Amino acid sequence: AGLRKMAQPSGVVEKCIVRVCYGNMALNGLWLGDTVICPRHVIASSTTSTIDYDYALSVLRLHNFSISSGNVFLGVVGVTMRGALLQIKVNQNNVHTPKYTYRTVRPGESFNILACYDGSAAGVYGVNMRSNYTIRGSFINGACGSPGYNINNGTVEFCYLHQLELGSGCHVGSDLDGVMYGGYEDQPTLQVEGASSLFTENVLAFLYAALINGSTWWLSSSRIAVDRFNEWAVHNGMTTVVNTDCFSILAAKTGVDVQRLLASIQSLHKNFGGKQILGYTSLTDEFTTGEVIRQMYGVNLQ
Amino acid sequence: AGLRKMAQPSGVVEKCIVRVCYGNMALNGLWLGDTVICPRHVIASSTTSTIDYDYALSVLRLHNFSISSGNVFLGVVGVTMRGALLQIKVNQNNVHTPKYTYRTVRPGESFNILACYDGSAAGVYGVNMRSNYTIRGSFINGACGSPGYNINNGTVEFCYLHQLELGSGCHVGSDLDGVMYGGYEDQPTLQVEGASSLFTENVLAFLYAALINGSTWWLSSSRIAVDRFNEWAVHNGMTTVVNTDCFSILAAKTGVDVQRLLASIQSLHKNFGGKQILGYTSLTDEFTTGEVIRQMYGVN
Ligand SMILES: CC(C)(C)c1ccc(N(C(=O)c2c[nH]cn2)[C@@H](C(=O)NC2CCCCC2)c2cccnc2)cc1
Ligand SMILES: CC(C)(C)c1ccc(N(C(=O)c2c[nH]cn2)[C@@H](C(=O)NC2CCCCC2)c2cccnc2)cc1
């Protein structure tokens, strides 16, 4: 019983964190094989104005780097640009490199953040990529380079390196190929995130979990067609629903079909009437169907 | 900026999880030094009816245990009873045992849960001990023996070993000395948890975190004294405010006194759910002052 946002165990990722310092800038890097990957703004001089990163790298002084895993210091062999990241070739292989891949996540997908400071893991929590390509993180100064990851069958899938915080407090990263999520710039210029729409498929997964956990007061006798809901959704800050075959077994276990939940979402989007659903007082879109099925039943969909 | 319920990195505890099987029962244990600690109901026969744990232990055959760390099986050399736990002596020392202590937590305290199945960690998340001595976990069958703990300067402080789930879904465990939180029985019974209440000291911590993050729409322009709030609190599902010293550090940084936050709690309670605070239910009680200070300022 229960539904909690949770992270996968962080042990295999913890051994990949290093401290990367250039001059007076210090942040975190990921050490995999003989490469350290980190945000390129570690070589930015000052926080304003626009940075010519190509020029900065051209006048780089390699011995001005300090890269360490605990008190293991890594010598820098070379540095090249990789989008919004640096690829730093170092002189030692991380013998604790896990089996890993890179994958770029899409809005609505969940992953784990390993929040790091001074090159050491400090905390771990689950996040979900918003439609505006930001995440609801908790980071303070020094967390840049903190990685986001999933673990599938022993393979670490890296999908995020923390880059910056927008004025509203939402958090922006790049994928490990250096492509910034949402096209935000790694520059100090003013930029604002777009509006956030609730990922409706995730809201549906949450309401199914609510039913499985005995929360039913909110459920509607009505029902609304997918097509009609989608018309309403785009005027009410929620995404459209594409298809319901991922709710197949959830629909069977509870007896409630998507159309009934869609009508429930419409009533609950205003307010919860002073009531709560699993402790929430507004709809949450942070849980995917995969997370719900895993937490309800211990099945990992592939 | 931001506020999230965070777990500490779980690596040092992952290496201490083992699978403990006896008869038709399988759960998780904690392997520290040459001992494996697990709930004693692993030696109960079935779940249909009550059993005498002392009798169960008196006729136990050591070789009926199967205890494994990964694919490495441990020999069992002795077993004794420790409250609602077993202390199983094994024939190998865990070379990955961290520096560790035990401590029994109080209602309102936070700790980390490493949710485990078949002797291997599956997820990690923070919790907070409720006033009825339950936690709001996420567990399914086979999670028993999952540990709860805190990490302070590399020392692991174990405070919880998961024992059972109640009808309402809340979760019951024991401390590592075998003392069940809340006095619940490790028996198949009709027991139900006591009344739940919001932990007001944690709501105060959360509201300070909101202020630190620039959230002020809910801040009352007036104040209420603690004694008057405590009268109201016990009639509105909240705990009384007993210790105020823990908020000195947060008042010193926000310049907002506790009395003003108490008046804000009353107003939030009267329109419960009308607006979120930092993307949370306004009367969130899962964050402690310690958690807020760490996340806002990095201070240990
Ligand atoms: C150079 C550049 C791209 C402008 C920059 C500057 C600072 C940082 N921030 C580092 O904390 C940091 C810097 N170097 C090591 N850490 C922080 C940050 O984003 N403030 C923002 C201020 C407005 C516009 C620039 C970014 C930060 C804080 C909290 C959580 N996340 C990040 C990130 C990027
Ligand atoms: C023997 C005893 C004390 C009655 C018992 C029986 C079953 C378990 N539960 C095991 O899953 C389990 C048991 N052994 C290995 N796994 C589950 C459980 O609590 N059902 C309860 C049924 C009502 C009251 C008794 C316990 C469980 C589920 C989810 C999370 N936590 C635990 C726990 C304790």
> What is A11-90's CATH topology?
Thrombin, subunit H (2.40.10)
Do the domains A11-90 and A200-297 sit in the same CATH topology, yes or no?
A: no
Cβ contacts of residue B243 below 8 Å, gap of 6+? B201
> Exposed, middle or buried, B15 (CB in 10 Å: 0-12/13-18/19+)?
middle
Identify which of B41, B144, B180 to mutate to test ligand 2's pocket (most ligand atoms within 8 A of the CB).
B144
Rounded to 10 deg, the angle between the B258-270 and B200-212 helix axes is 100
Cross-chain Cβ contact B123/A213 below 8 Å: no
Token pair in block for residue B161: 């070993």
Q: Which CATH code for domain B200-297?
A: 1.10.1840.10
Strands annotated E in B13-129: 17-22, 25-32, 35-39, 65-69, 72-74, 76-82, 85-90, 100-102, 110-117, 120-128
Cβ neighbours around A108 below 10 Å, total: 19
**Which among A180, A198, A207 has a CA at the least distance from the CA of A296?**
A207
Sign of CA dihedral A39, A45, A48, A53: negative
Q: Does domain B11-89 have CATH number 2.40.10.10?
A: yes
Q: What is the largest CA-CA distance in chain A?
A: 69
In whole angstroms, what is the distance from residue A268 CA to residue A277 CA? 10
Given resolution (angstroms): 1.5
In whole angstroms, what is the distance from residue B17 CA to residue B128 CA? 22
Helices (H) and strands (E) in chain A, counts: 7, 13
In DSSP terms, which residues pair with B156 in a beta bridge?
B100, B151
Q: Is A203 helix (H, G, I), strand (E, B) or coil?
A: helix
Which B-chain residues 52-71 have CB contacts (< 8 A) with chain A? none
Question: A150 CB near a chain B CB, below 8 Å?
Answer: no
In whole angstroms, what is the distance from residue B1 CA to residue A141 CA? 9
Cβ contacts of residue A147 below 8 Å, gap of 6+? A13, A16, A17, A28, A30, A113, A114, A116, A158, A160, A161, A162
Alpha helices in chain B (DSSP H): 11-14, 53-58, 200-212, 226-233, 248-254, 258-270, 289-297
Q: Quick one: DSSP state of residue B297?
A: H
**Which among B101, B114, B108, B239 has a CA at the least distance from the CA of B175?**
B101
Task: Assess whether the previous peptide bond of A49 is cis (omega < 30° from 0).
Answer: yes
In DSSP terms, which residues pair with B30 in a beta bridge?
B17, B37
- Over the range A198-220, which residues count as b (16 or more CB within 10 Å of their CB) and which as e? bbbbbbbbbbbbbbbbebeebbb
Question: A253 CB near a chain B CB, below 8 Å?
Answer: no
Question: B6 CB near a chain A CB, below 8 Å?
Answer: yes
B210: left (phi over 0), alpha (psi -120 to 50) or beta: alpha
Cβ pair B158, B104 in contact under 8 A: no
Cβ neighbours around A58 below 10 Å, total: 8
A211: left (phi over 0), alpha (psi -120 to 50) or beta: alpha
Q: Is A250 helix (H, G, I), strand (E, B) or coil?
A: helix
Residue B252 Cβ < 6 Å to ligand 2: no
Cβ pair A90, A77 in contact under 8 A: yes
B11 is catalytic: no
Amino acid A22 reads Y
For the sheet with A76-82, list strands across it.
A72-74, A65-69, A17-22, A25-32, A35-39, A85-90, A76-82
- Among the listed residues B83, B123, B142, B290, the single catalytic one is B142
In DSSP terms, which residues pair with B196 in a beta bridge?
none
> How far does the CA of residue B169 sit from the closest CA of chain A (Å)?
5
Ligand 2: distance of its center to the CA of A202 in Å? Answer: 29
Cβ pair A287, A296 in contact under 8 A: no
Cβ pair B265, B283 in contact under 8 A: yes
Token pair in block for residue A257: 């079909």
Main-chain dihedrals φ then ψ at residue A5, nearest 5 degrees: -65, 125
- Among the listed residues B16, B38, B41, B126, the single catalytic one is B41
Residue A188 Cβ < 6 Å to ligand 1: yes
